[PDB]
Design a binder for this molecule. Structure first.
Ligand code: HEM
Ligand code: HEM
Lengths: 55, 270, 32, 43, 106, 56, 419, 446, 33, 111, 55
């Protein structure tokens, strides 16, 4: 490969678990809670750090 | 299994987090809730007592404890993120199961094309709920109305954990004995890691097995029932109910489901 | 090649127990 | 569970106890420094 | 001594399958099993016909799941047609491994 | 039921130069050591109690 | 103490036995399937069959089979010949029974499972690769396919293109047609014949005539040449030998030895070997030459084998020929035939001085003849060869359709018209 | 009917006998056609000094090319025309020449052999002709990783000792080697008692003893002094020699822990141990189902091409280990399993497992003895090795005392906490660091 | 691969009953004459 | 990735050099085909139902000549940019890009 | 592979960047500062969390 951004950096390859990964077709709405799970972890954190900026 | 065991750790780590953050604001509910939970650790016979006193940094919950929670609340979430990623790592080695319960390798899709929009959409609804709550009914879901600065002689006769921890408080109540209640409280949550071993059916998918779909739902509704007890006066009516709900929960998880599994397998002739 | 190659003298490098050329290291080796 | 149990396995268990037995002793020693029992100190 | 009870069970079994998603889906009961190390080896043991079949079935099935669409009433898996085609293969794989344990044990 | 005394007869008649109380495997050995340990310890503990009770 | 004891049954399977003194007993069922029993469509099947001995069968799972023999320290060896297929089975006196029941499953109850046979497949390549490391094997193989047309021209190793294509009904068919009663011969080196028979009778009664593979023989002169990059070159020059267990044959064997150069001395050079002397004189310093002698049921192959360097290939090759022409011109003195003979005789005896050797010798005889010829008798036959006889045979190589196979840099390797 | 044990006791006993000079006579009778008479001299490579390091091995090329009685090709012609084969093998401890031959051929057999040992017509021409050959053999032995590596092992586990030298010897000692030097060599070391005249098959001991004629007896003090130099201990050294050649397609690794002399109760129990690990090749028919883990793993995971455990037995030294050939990328995994198998063995052996190996041993040790040649070498070598006993029926007994605890305790002497002797002929790029192989011999984890 | 440079290699095939006999076994494996 | 990549580059980043080389290639392709009798006959026959009754042979060079790196860039972006692909495979197509991936390959945000 | 603890868990393989990794032979003492750098971050962290337990 040449200038395939993704696998060029080794780091950026590690991020291709989001984009290129095999994901089953059929899949209830239930699985979105994984992702949202992370969403919440990131929101609490940003929020926490600002509150702990005045607590 | 390996992914399940990380999950479990995840779950419990957040659980600690939530317990200490709620105490940071140092209000009547927080103050007492910490005492009664922490003290519930003094059930252990030999150590307990000494150990509750180390955790608190003294004999009560004064400044010493209050700054500890601030520090651990702060540092848990960072540690937890590492865990999450570790969790993701393991899961990436076998991909996502489905409603049918069968491998999909014969049907696989681009995560980017499809699942990035799904996830963004998911967000959109998630945020919705978070702002709906936060903007229209800020306090609604935050049962506790105790915006009262904590006075160590004062007590809301109705002391209870939040909705996430409501189930835990209820589990402790059904057992007369202190220690029996702490064990059973841990087992509530800690019973998760058993379920792998309990699995009895040939179909990892409950989707094709009615009977577990019925007892799965019931557990969920038993779990709702337990959450209710949590905000209940600890009196006869609620006691007797909680006690049968706490047996139902462990039956559903330990004994009913596993049998149902077998049955279904035998009806399919498997 | 392989036949020609031979080990460099390890006497200086080697331990006193194994230093001797004509005697056993088994009854001297364990202590080291 | 059932698969793990075997007639053949016993030598390993015996061997494990010593290593396990030795390991068990270390914890008592490790715990004791932290525990600081007056009785332990007296010993 | 099972004549009436088992007879009810036989009737019950059809209901159980009907109750079960796989019959409704149209996919075979054997195909539904939790893909673990034994199933895996059985799977591998399948003939081209049997085995390619299980791939289309699951393909058609995960397609439906993705679209939340059920197959037409006319095209559904009928309990009376329980191809337990994995069963034969799956049994042995287990059989072999149970032995392995016996030989290993003694 | 079973009837496999024939297997055990063979197992126990096997000329492995082992004493009957060990001729049967690894468990025999752990049982032995457990028993022996408890007895000796107990005996030690008892001597301690007597030394202790000897005094006013 | 007790000598062997053959017994042909109604099925036509032979069985022998020798309760020896020593601790180790070895059974070995020799079935009459060689490589020669496959067709264009069936080539490579014995090979795979040979490698698939430890697969699940009707009464014993691949795991039990292997772990079982290990349990007791037993060995299970299958010997494959262009004509025959010996299925050997060694173990301790006490454990024959556990072992025998293994040999019987492997051979009468194979269950080639699509999945199991499939994982083997790749083994064929690995096996072919390791035996094709000795020039001798690819040349010696090339020889047989050049010299024959149809049956014995089939090689022992599976053809590269066939490997993964070996199907389970193929294996099943081959066993069924060839692994039968009439073609079998049990052989024990430390078992009771009385008890052997019983077992034989209980487990070896299956029907199957010969040639459902396409039996028949035929010789066709031809040359197979394989160019390489290697300094050294090997080539074989061979004419229709006499057939198996016949006088002509035997004569060949004796002749073989008059030229035959299989060193009897470490680091030692032959004084006896004519080929070597003659070759040597006209040849360079480093060179290797040996006489070749093959004998099968319906044909043979006699001639020599050479190992020369690039430029010396011809010189050596002709040299060797010329010398064997000498014997065919008549030039051969009595003193050398008797040496030869004694050489042969000594060899055959040492051949059978071991259990493994004896067991092979015996089974071998049971598939050819139908009984065991004792050594002595054997010895007599070889002696009957006339000094002339030898010459006469030799006359036949020089005046018999040529067939050669070589490998390496072939700038200097004579063709058919070259010699 | 007849049962293993029985057979065992019924086996023809070996008769050991002595001439006046110490010529040892042994023989096992069967009244069979072919016979393999042999003279098993025990002056090997380990007696050689740095110069004559390849002495003995040189004599072996001359052994069969003339006697003052039997000049140029008179030896071969004689053997040949009989149909007898003549072989010469040389070890670091044992030189031996034997003949395979019709039983009726003893007469001229034993004469020949005897002749060979004593009179060797060796002219300058034959010396300069052999040199060239040797130098060419050397070059060819460098073409063999397994031989290159096993030499290395010895050199590094014997660094600083006479025993660590190649039997082939030093390149240039072949060039240099004085013609006078082969004499002193022979003269000093071929003097029996060293030697043994052994044989098996259809002969009568009586005649072998009567038939044998000693050309000369090495009463010599030098003969004793020459022996005297021999038998000294050779210092044990755990070092590695890593000769990396990425040019080569595979990798050979020989890993060893020093062991017991020829005679020792621990020395049969070891064997039973290696029975368990076993030995394995690309072409084993059992592969994945083979009962020795290294084999199964190997078979299963395409871990290695071929692997064998060995027990090299010398009077004062012993090389113990296995040897595996494996792709460049699998050197570490096979190291791991192997060493792993060792440790598991000295802490967790189970009676089942040791009982299977046991029985393997018996077979390996009975089946070897099939044939005349075999028996003869056991009888000859057995006498300089283990002295004048023939432990054949004892074995089963000794092998019988084997217990899972015996096997465990004996294995732990030699492998556990001991320092390895490792050599490889790379692709050794992935070969474990000496300290890693070291810590492999004790159990914290892994 | 083993170098075949000198007078040492004579290999040529010819036995009594067996000719070019190939044997495959789990314990062992080979090619004779 | 490489191919689609090439497309994109083409309609945004064509350089006169590059176009001029392809230009010339075309000429040759178009001249050398016409070597031989069969070839000329097909061009003449097919040309008539295709392009009608013209034989644009000498024109070509002219037309080909009007080629510019801007011409080639604007002409390519009508047909490949933002346009929806027609993709078929005959697997192992297990790794073949998801329709939406292929699609997004016809426009340039990154990659 | 079977029972090769390291590669069994995928997670445990990730940790064989410490144990099995190719490391240059020659190597000044200077390199020990990378590792030491990380000891310092861990030290600071534990210390910080205990200080911020009473600050
Ligand atoms: C999911 C992990 C976390 C959860 C479950 C959580 C939950 C909570 C809860 C329930 C409270 C009580 C607020 C109230 O009712 O007044 C709280 C307070 C607080 N949390 Fe968080 N929190 C988390 C992470 C964090 C982080 C990462 C930080 C700092 C970076 C943080 C800083 C604070 C502060 C300073 C307060 C005190 C002031 C207040 O009451 O808002 N928290 N947290
Ligand atoms: C900090 C809290 C957590 C986060 C952010 C998180 C996140 C995720 C995400 C984003 C996924 C993929 C989508 C899905 O299947 O829903 C996932 C899957 C999974 N999680 Fe979690 N998780 C957390 C807690 C847990 C807990 C407590 C456990 C179990 C004890 C767990 C076990 C699993 C399992 C087994 C899967 C894979 C299921 C499958 O698709 O077959 N998770 N997690």
């Amino acid at each position: 490969m040449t200038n395939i951004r993704k696998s060029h950096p080794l780091m950026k390859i590690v991020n291709n678990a989001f984009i290129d990964l095999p994901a089953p077709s059929n899949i209830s709405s239930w699985w979105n809670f994984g992702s949202l799970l992370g969403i919440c972890l990131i929101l609490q954190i940003l929020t926490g750090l600002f509150l702990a900026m005045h607590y | 299994l390996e992914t399940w065991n990380i999950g479990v750790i995840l779950l419990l780590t957040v659980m600690a987090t939530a317990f200490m953050g709620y105490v940071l604001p140092w209000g009547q509910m927080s103050f007492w809730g910490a005492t009664v939970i922490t003290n519930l650790l003094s059930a252990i016979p030999y150590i307990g007592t000494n150990l509750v006193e180390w955790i608190w940094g003294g004999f009560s919950v004064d400044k010493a404890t209050l700054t500890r929670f601030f520090a651990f609340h702060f540092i848990l979430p960072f540690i937890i993120m590492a865990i999450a990623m570790v969790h993701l790592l393991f899961l990436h080695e076998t991909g996502s199961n489905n409603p049918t319960g069968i491998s999909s390798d014969v049907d696989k899709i681009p995560f980017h094309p499809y699942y990035t929009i799904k996830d963004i959409l998911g967000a959109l609804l998630l945020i919705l709920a978070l702002m709906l709550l936060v903007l229209f009914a800020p306090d609604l879901l935050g049962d506790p109305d105790n915006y009262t600065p904590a006075n160590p002689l004062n007590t809301p006769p109705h002391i209870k954990p939040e909705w996430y921890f409501l189930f835990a408080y209820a589990i402790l109540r059904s057992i007369p004995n202190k220690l029996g209640g702490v064990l059973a409280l841990a087992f509530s949550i800690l019973i998760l890691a058993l379920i792998p071993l309990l699995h009895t059916s040939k179909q990892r998918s409950m989707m094709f097995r009615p009977l577990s779909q019925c007892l799965f739902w019931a557990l969920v509704a038993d779990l709702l029932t337990l959450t209710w007890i949590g905000g209940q006066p600890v009196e006869h009516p609620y006691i007797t109910i909680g006690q049968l709900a706490s047996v139902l929960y462990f039956l559903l998880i330990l004994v009913l489901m596993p049998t149902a599994g077998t049955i279904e397998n035998k009806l399919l002739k498997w | 090649s392989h036949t020609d190659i031979k080990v460099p003298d390890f006497s200086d490098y080697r331990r006193p127990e194994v230093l001797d050329s004509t005697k056993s290291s088994k009854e001297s080796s364990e202590a080291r | 569970l059932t698969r793990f149990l075997g007639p053949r396995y016993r030598q390993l268990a015996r061997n494990w106890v010593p290593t396990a037995s030795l390991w068990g002793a270390v914890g008592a020693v490790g715990l004791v420094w932290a525990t600081d029992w007056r009785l332990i100190l007296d010993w | 001594a099972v004549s009436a009870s088992s007879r009810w069970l036989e009737g019950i079994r059809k209901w159980y399958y009907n109750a079960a998603g796989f019959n409704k889906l149209g996919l075979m009961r054997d195909d539904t099993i939790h893909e673990n190390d034994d199933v895996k080896e059985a799977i591998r043991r399948l003939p081209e016909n049997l085995y390619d079949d299980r791939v289309f079935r699951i393909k058609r099935a995960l397609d439906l799941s993705m679209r939340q669409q059920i197959l037409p009433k006319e095209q559904w898996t009928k309990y009376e047609e329980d191809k337990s085609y994995l069963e034969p293969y799956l049994k042995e794989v287990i059989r072999e491994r149970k032995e392995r344990e016996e030989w290993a044990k003694k | 039921f079973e009837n496999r005394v024939a297997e055990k007869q063979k197992l126990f008649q096997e000329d492995n130069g082992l004493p009957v109380h060990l001729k049967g495997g690894a468990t025999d050995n752990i049982l032995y050591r457990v028993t022996m340990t408890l007895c000796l310890g107990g005996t030690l503990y008892s001597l301690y109690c007597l030394g202790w009770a000897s005094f006013p | 103490p007790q000598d062997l004891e053959f017994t042909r049954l109604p099925n036509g399977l032979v069985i022998a036995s020798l309760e020896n003194y020593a601790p180790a007993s070895r059974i070995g069922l020799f079935i009459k399937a060689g490589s020669r029993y496959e067709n264009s469509n069936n080539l490579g099947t014995s090979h795979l069959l040979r490698l698939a001995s430890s697969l699940t069968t009707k009464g014993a799972s691949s795991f039990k089979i292997t772990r079982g023999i290990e349990a007791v320290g037993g060995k299970l060896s299958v010997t494959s010949t262009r004509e025959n297929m010996a299925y050997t089975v060694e173990c301790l006196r006490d454990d024959v029974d556990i072992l025998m029941e293994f040999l019987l499953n492997v051979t009468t109850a194979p269950e080639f499972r699509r999945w199991e046979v499939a994982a083997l497949q790749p083994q064929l390549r690995i096996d072919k690769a390791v035996a094709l490391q000795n020039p001798q094997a690819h040349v010696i193989e090339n020889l047989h396919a050049a010299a024959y047309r149809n049956a014995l021209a089939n090689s022992l190793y599976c053809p590269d293109y066939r490997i993964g294509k070996v199907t389970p009904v193929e294996l099943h068919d081959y066993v069924q047609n060839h692994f039968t009663s009439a073609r079998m011969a049990l052989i024990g080196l430390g078992v009771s014949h009385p008890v052997l028979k019983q077992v034989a009778e209980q487990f070896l009664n299956i029907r199957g005539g010969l040639g459902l593979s396409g039996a028949k023989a035929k010789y066709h002169g031809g040359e197979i040449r394989e160019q390489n990059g290697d300094s050294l070159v090997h080539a074989a020059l061979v004419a229709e030998s006499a057939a198996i267990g016949s006088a002509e044959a035997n004569a060949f064997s004796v002749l073989q030895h008059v030229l035959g150069a299989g060193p009897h001395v470490k680091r030692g050079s032959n004084a006896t070997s004519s080929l070597y002397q003659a070759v040597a004189k006209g040849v360079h310093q480093p060179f290797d030459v040996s006489a070749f002698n093959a004998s099968y049921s319906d044909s043979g192959l006699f001639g020599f084998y050479t190992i020369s360097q690039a430029a010396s290939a011809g010189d050596v090759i002709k040299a060797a020929y010329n010398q064997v022409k000498t014997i065919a011109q008549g030039n051969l003195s009595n003193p050398d035939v008797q040496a030869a003979k004694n050489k042969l005789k000594a060899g055959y005896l040492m051949s059978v001085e071991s259990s493994e050797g004896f067991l092979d010798e015996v089974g071998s005889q049971a598939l050819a003849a139908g009984s065991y010829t004792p050594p002595s008798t054997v010895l007599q036959q070889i002696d009957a060869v006339a000094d002339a006889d030898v010459i006469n045979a030799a006359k036949k190589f020089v005046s018999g359709r040529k067939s050669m196979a070589a490998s390496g840099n072939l700038g200097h390797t004579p063709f058919i018209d070259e010699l | 009917t007849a049962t293993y044990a029985q057979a065992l006791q019924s086996v023809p006993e070996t008769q050991v006998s002595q001439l006046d000079n110490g010529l040892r006579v042994a023989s096992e009778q069967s009244s069979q056609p072919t016979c393999t008479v042999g003279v098993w001299i025990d002056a090997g490579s380990r007696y050689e000094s740095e110069k004559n390091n390849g002495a003995g091995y040189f004599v072996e090329h001359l052994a069969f090319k003339g006697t003052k009685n039997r000049p140029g090709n008179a030896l071969e012609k004689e053997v040949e025309s009989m149909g007898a084969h003549l072989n010469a093998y040389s070890t670091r401890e044992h030189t031996a020449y034997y003949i395979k031959a019709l039983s009726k051929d003893l007469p001229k057999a034993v004469e020949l052999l005897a002749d060979i040992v004593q009179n060797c017509s060796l002219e300058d021409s034959q010396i300069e002709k052999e040199r060239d050959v040797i130098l060419q053999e050397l070059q060819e032995n460098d073409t063999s990783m397994r031989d290159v590596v096993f030499n290395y092992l010895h050199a590094t586990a014997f660094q600083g000792t006479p025993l660590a030298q190649s039997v082939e010897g030093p390149s240039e000692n072949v060039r240099k080697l004085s013609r006078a030097d082969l004499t002193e060599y022979l003269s000093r070391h071929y003097k029996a008692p060293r030697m043994v005249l052994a044989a098996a098959g259809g002969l009568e001991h009586r005649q072998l003893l009567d038939l044998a004629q000693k050309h000369f007896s090495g009463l010599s003090g030098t003969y004793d002094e020459d022996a005297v130099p021999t038998l000294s201990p050779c210092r044990f050294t755990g070092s590695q020699i890593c000769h990396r050649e990425d040019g080569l397609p595979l990798a050979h690794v020989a890993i060893a822990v020093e062991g017991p002399g020829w005679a020792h109760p621990d020395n049969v129990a070891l064997q039973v141990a290696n029975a368990i690990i076993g030995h394995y090749d690309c072409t084993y028919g059992g592969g994945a189902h083979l009962s020795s883990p290294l084999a199964s793993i190997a078979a299963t995971n395409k871990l290695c091409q071929s692997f064998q455990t060995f027990n090299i037995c010398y009077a004062d030294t012993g090389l113990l280990g296995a040897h595996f050939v494996c792709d460049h990328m699998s050197i570490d995994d096979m190291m791991f399993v192997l060493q792993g198998q060792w440790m598991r063995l000295c802490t967790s052996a189970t009676e089942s497992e040791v009982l299977r190996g046991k029985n393997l041993l018996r077979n390996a040790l009975v089946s070897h003895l099939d044939g005349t040649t075999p028996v003869c070498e056991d009888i000859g070598r057995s006498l300089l090795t283990y002295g004048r006993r023939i432990p054949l029926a004892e074995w089963e007994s000794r092998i019988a005392e084997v217990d899972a605890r015996v096997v465990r305790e004996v294995c732990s002497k030699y492998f556990y906490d001991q320092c390895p002797a490792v050599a490889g002929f790379g692709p050794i790029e992935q070969l474990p660091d000496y300290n890693r192989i070291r810590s492999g011999m004790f159990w914290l984890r892994f | 691969k083993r170098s075949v440079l000198c007078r040492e290699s004579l290999r040529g095939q010819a036995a009594g009953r067996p000719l070019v006999a190939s044997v495959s076994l789990n314990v062992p494996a080979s090619v004779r004459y």
